[PDB]
């Protein structure tokens with residue numbers, strides 16, 4: 482009944498297609514985990530669903546409605562299960578509204594404890610792979626991206642930032658409510674959401690051939706001296722990356738710089754950026770994920786290399802665009818891998834999905850493919866890959882099939898050497 486993920490086999494509901502989350506989240510004390518929520522999911526289905534089953538971990542549901550009517554529901558250890566008056570069938574949509582409140586809950590196999598983070602007067606989502614269920618009843622699996630509208634209610638002395646265009650801020654009874662609209666669909670973990678002492682700072686629009694990309698970064702209080710985004714760097718990165726991948730998927734881009742010590746997460750249009758991770762290559766990496774991870778989403782967590790490896794390889798494309806020697810950079814990555822265990826790129830265990838192979842063997846896989854077919858065909862292929870897997874989750878098998886179709890059998894064989902096999906292949910060289 483779950484999505485059947487090979488790494489996280491309990492998450493999600495098979496066949497559920499959440500199309501939109503309309504979330505009103507109230508955070509009474511930023512930096513403390515308690516919260517209350519009011520969410521309406523607009524849901525479709527790929528198969529008839531007699532129940533809607535959502536992931537939820539911590540908060541307690543107090544009320545539920547289906548299309549504005551009372552509905553039967555039960556909350557278990559990690560799910561909310563709603564019985565519909567009749568099955569939701571493919572092509573239809575319905576509105577599931579859930580009222581909930583409590584404490585989001587945050588596994589040695591992962592680099593972080595994902596979910597609703599609380600520290601230093603800030604509460605924020607750092608929820609890859611499966612933490613969003615802590616503060617939002619959701620289909621918590623990247624095969625089911627969705628658009629989001631988020632209203633965050635916080636004390637008037639605080640502020641908030643969520644993924645999407647910021648439209649309105651209202652204040653009453655000492656409470657401030659800010660509204661954000663994420664209009665291109667992304668996975669649940671790509672929903673950025675930060676509350677606390679933060680401020681928005683805009684930059685000039687970035688004009689790309691096909692689109693305009695708005696610019697704003699979020700700065701939290703307490704940042705280390707020298708925490709910045711170099712002026713004009715983001716526009717050049719957008720230009721270089723979009724020339725390689727195709728149009729930037731979203732309407733805005735920036736980073737939310739936080740004074741915490743943590744990994745950077747490619748939350749949609751607004752990367753969640755602990756100051757300790759704020760380096761050029763990480764900023765490029767997180768922006769590349771806006772394509773590889775946020776627009777092109779994973780069908781299964783075993784295939785994280787399709788996100789982490791592509792985003793990593795984007796750093797090398799960026800370096801070359803700035804005049805650096807890409808082969809030396811690939812050689813540096815290879816030297817690092819040569820003294821570490823290697824594995825086939827499809828992960829078999831949770832401990833692997835963010836390991837060195839997902840990043841650097843994944844990137845070197847693309848390096849091998851690029852060297853086999855030349856830069857023109859490689860760029861054309863990346864454009865085709867993004868379009869092919871827009872609106873459709875990707876898998877390693879589907880990648881190889883597309884390479885075979887678009888680039889030919891020898892290209893596919895080159896990639897397969899890197900995708901398959903326990904030992905590390907030789908360094909890809911011209």
Ligand SMILES: [Zn+2]
Nearest residue numbers: 498499625626
């Ligand atoms: Zn969806």
Ligand SMILES: [Zn+2]
Nearest residue numbers: 766770789792
């Ligand atoms: Zn990454």
